[PDB]
Each structure stands twice: as structure tokens, then as C-alpha cells.
Structure 1
Amino acid sequence: NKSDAAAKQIKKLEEDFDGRIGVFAIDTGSGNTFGYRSDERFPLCSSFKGFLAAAVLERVQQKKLDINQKVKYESRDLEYHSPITTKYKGSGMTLGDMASAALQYSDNGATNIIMERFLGGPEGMTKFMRSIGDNEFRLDRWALELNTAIPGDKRDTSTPKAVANSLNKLALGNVLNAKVKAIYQNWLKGNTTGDARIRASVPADWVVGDKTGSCGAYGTANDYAVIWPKNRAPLIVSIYTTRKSKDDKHSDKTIAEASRIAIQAID
């Protein structure tokens, strides 16, 4: 009942914003879930940057990479939206600081430097997700270029369910050991780009780690989060949206509200 009604409200909400809404939410304590269009495909936009940071952490843990190892890139033509990498181009950055920048500011230069040098490009990123049991995720193109969000293009997409399940595994599961897991979780908590999304949907005394995506086209934006309520078990929330026309703008309020609705469903 609480699930069917929840679904009606998501459906009216996508009708109000003239697009498509995908939701998957998990209560990790009760194992309750709620899903709407959770197995439909949606562009990742920047959101894969959250999974990229975890990939780096897995390498670190197998001692293939040092978190403090220096990354130099002073001759690189930096991608658009490299707010962090741009400032430090002259000195370079630690891998840790680069990886966290890719997540916490969605830095394109950080994302792409990491993917060229450490992770084996998009396909290596895809391989990483496969290796944790995620069979929907696919990364086809590099950061920035992948944000075309052309309707019916399956490149650089996943599903809300798969995103939630992957996030669950990485943020709360046993893919990462206790140490590098805790670094991952802190990274997520310190995200700077999602105050108007899942974060706006929860009491302020709840702790959230999230990663957003905003393609800048077809009104395509997303957010995914781990939520540590007070006096309650962690939640996972995964919110993916598209709109009909190229010049449709994304809707933060729609994500926020879908998040409220989703959380009600699993309460």
C-alpha cells in the first residue's frame, strides 16, 4: 500500500516536470526497498565519479597505488569544470586529493587523469563495476564528452537499482576494508555539489554522503546517497532523471521531492 501510493506520487511528479524519474531506495536495516523505473536506463553524467573514487581506493588497498603519491600534469590542457585541478596544476596533487576532487567537486581533469593513468580508461572503469557484481553500469566515453545524454543512447548509462546496489556494496559492504572504506565514506560525506538534492530531503541531523550528475542537456540530472539517520540503520537513495527536449533544464526540486517520497516508502 505504502509502496503503491508512493509510486503514484512519483508518477504524478514526472508528469509535472515533463520527463522520466527513476528511483531505488534501500533500508539496510529492514531490507525494505522501493523502486520506480529502477531497471530503466538513465545517463550517468558525472555520477560515475563516485564509483571512480572507490576504484582508486581499491587499487590503494592492494598496494598498487600510494594515496600520497604525487600526480604531475603541468602541460595538460585541462578539461572544462576542473575547479580543483586548475588551481594546483603548477605543483601537482596527491592521488588521494585528486580522487577526492573528482568526487567532491566533480573535477573533470581529476577524473580523466585518473582514468588514463590508473584505471584503464572507461572500459577499466566498467570492468571495476562488473567486478563487484554490477551488470548494468557501462562507461563508454571519457568525462565531459560522455554528457550528451541523447535520448536512446545507451552509452554511459546505468539503472537506479544498480547504482544503489553498487553504492551499498562500496560504502557499506566489504569491497573495501575498514580503513579505506572509512576514507571512501568521508569523501562521500564531504561532497559539495548536492545541497539542493537528496540532502535537502532529510532532517539536518542526518549525515549524508552523495555524488550528483548534471549532463547539462535533456534536463538530465541525478543524485545518489548513503544516509546515516540518527537512531536508525543506514539508507541508500538513487535518483535519476531525463527530460524530453535538448534545452529542458534539470530540476533539483524534483530530485529533492523524489527523494522525500522514496524515503517515506521504505520508512
Structure 2
Amino acid sequence: NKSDAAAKQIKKLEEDFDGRIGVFAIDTGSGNTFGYRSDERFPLCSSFKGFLAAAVLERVQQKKLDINQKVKYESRDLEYHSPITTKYKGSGMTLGDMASAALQYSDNGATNIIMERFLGGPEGMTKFMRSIGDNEFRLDRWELELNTAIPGDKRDTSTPKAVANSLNKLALGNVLNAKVKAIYQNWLKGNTTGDARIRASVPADWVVGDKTGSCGAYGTANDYAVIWPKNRAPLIVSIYTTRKSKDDKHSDKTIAEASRIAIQAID
């Protein structure tokens, strides 16, 4: 019945802002879980960039790539929203710096460059996810087109549960070795976009690593996080939303609230 109460609360919240909320949360210290719409599809938007950074680190770990190899792009027309790659166009960036920009600032140039040159495009990004046992995730298009968040479209979607399981595996599990996982965690912990989301749903002294997504259409926005509560084993929270209408804006406050509810549901 605690699951049932949390379900009623999410259902009401999603009705209050005329949209759809999907939630999965895991307490890693007990195995307890909470889901609502946990198997339904939601656009990933920028959130997939957190997995794209994990894929680079796996490549590094495998000695396929080097974390400090110079990535050069002096002639490229940077995609819109490339705040970090635009500052280093003249000089190039290290591969590790590039991947972390794609994660912590959602940098679109960084994303496109990495998929074109190191990850085998959207199909290769999908391949990596299948290789960690994620069967729901799919990326179909490149930046910026992956963001259209058309209702009923299944391109560039995943499920809250699968995203949560995958972040569990990547941030806490054993896909990455102890060394390279620490780096991923640090990247996550220093995300710059997430302050009004899962982060705002927890005490200021809990440590959080997250990655947000804001398609910019259909009120579509999301966040996933590892939370290290003080004196307790880590939580995983995954929150996805869509809204009914094209011009609807996303709601940071609904995400934060949905995370507050999900985190009490697994208390």
C-alpha cells in the first residue's frame, strides 16, 4: 500500500499539469523499488548524454581510445548549444574534457563529434546500451533532431526503469573498473543543469550526481540521479515527463516533486 499511495500522488500530479510522469527509484541498500509508468516510453532528450559519456569511458578502459587524446574540429559548424566546444574550437579538446562537457553542460557539438568519430552514431550508442543489458533504450537520430518529442513517436526513447537500471549498472555496478567508474561519478557529481530537479528534492548535505534532459517541445523534460544520502547506501532516481501540447513548457517543479514522492516510496 505504500507503493499505492505514492502512485495516487504521482497520478494526481501528472493530472494537475495535464501531462505524463514516469518514475523508477531504487534503494541500493535494501533492493526496494518504486515505479509509476515505469515501462512506458519517454523521449531521452539530453539525458542520453550521460550514457554517452559512460560509453566513452568504456572505450578508454578497453584501450580503444585514450582519455587525453586531442580531439580537433577547427573547421566544424558547431550545433546550437555548444557552450563548451565553442570555447575550444581553435585548440581542440581532450577526449575526456569533451565527454564531460557533453554530460555536465549538455554540449551538442561535443555529443555529435563523439558519436560521429568514436561511438558509431546513434546505432553504436544503442549497441553500447544493449551490451550492458539495456533492451529498452534506443537512439535513432543525431542532435538536434533527436529532441522533437512528438507524442506517440518511439524514436529516441527509453523507459524510467531501464534508465534507472542502466545508471545503476554504470555509476555503481561493474561495467567500469574502480578507477574509471570514479571518474564517471565525479562527472555526474559536477553536472551544472540539474539544480531545480532531483537535486532540489533532497537535503543540501546529500551528494548527488545527475543528468537532465529538456527537449524544448511538448513540455518534455527529465532527470536521473545517483544520490549518496549521509550514512546510507546510494539511491537511484529516474523521472521522465511529457505534456499534452506542443508549446507547453517543462515543469522543473513537477520533476522535483515526483522525485520527492518516489524517494519516500522506497524509504
Q: TM range, normalised to the smaller chain?
A: over 0.9
**Quick one: distance in 1 between partners of 2:76 and 2:86?**
10
1:12 positional shift: 0.5
1:170 positional shift: 0.2
Q: Deviations over 1:55-75 (max 9, x none)?
A: 000000011111000000000
- Structure 2, unmatched stretches of 5+, are none
1:2 positional shift: 1.3
**Quick one: distance in 2 between partners of 1:157 and 1:97?**
27
Q: Which piece of structure 1 moves more, 114-123 or 1-10?
A: 1-10
- Taking only aligned residues, the RMSD between alpha carbons, in angstroms, comes to 0.4
Residue equivalent to 2:235:
235
1:181 positional shift: 0.2
Q: Deviations over 1:122-165 (max 9, x none)?
A: 00000000000000000000122100000011000000000000
SS at 1:138 equivalent: coil
**Quick one: distance in 1 between partners of 2:175 and 2:49?**
17
Alignment check: 8 A CA contact 1:198 1:256 kept: yes
SS at 1:199 equivalent: helix
- TM-score normalised to structure 2 length: 1.00
SS at 1:256 equivalent: helix
Alignment check: 8 A CA contact 1:54 1:170 kept: yes
1:3 positional shift: 1.0
**Quick one: distance in 2 between partners of 1:67 and 1:144?**
26
SS at 1:109 equivalent: helix
1:24 positional shift: 0.1
Q: Deviations over 1:27-55 (max 9, x none)?
A: 00100000000000000001000000000
SS at 2:51 equivalent: helix
Alignment check: 8 A CA contact 1:47 1:212 kept: yes
**Quick one: distance in 1 between partners of 2:166 and 2:144?**
22
Q: Deviations over 1:81-119 (max 9, x none)?
A: 000000110111000000000000000000000000000
1:218 positional shift: 0.3
Give the total of aligned pairs: 267
**Quick one: distance in 1 between partners of 2:217 and 2:143?**
15
Residue equivalent to 2:262:
262
1:213 positional shift: 0.2
**Quick one: distance in 2 between partners of 1:159 and 1:166?**
11
**Quick one: distance in 1 between partners of 2:151 and 2:17?**
17
**Quick one: distance in 2 between partners of 1:38 and 1:86?**
37
**Are 2:192 and 1:192 equivalent residues in the alignment?**
yes
Residue equivalent to 2:82:
82
**Quick one: distance in 1 between partners of 2:47 and 2:144?**
12
Identity %: 100
**Quick one: distance in 2 between partners of 1:145 and 1:182?**
32
SS at 2:23 equivalent: strand
Residue equivalent to 2:247:
247
Alignment check: 8 A CA contact 1:46 1:143 kept: no
1:204 positional shift: 0.5
Q: Deviations over 1:153-210 (max 9, x none)?
A: 1000000000000000000000000000000000000000000000000001000000
**Quick one: distance in 2 between partners of 1:144 and 1:196?**
24
- Find runs of 4+ consecutive structure 1 residues off by over 2 angstroms: none
- TM-score normalised to structure 1 length: 1.00
**Quick one: distance in 2 between partners of 1:122 and 1:147?**
13
Alignment check: 8 A CA contact 1:122 1:141 kept: yes
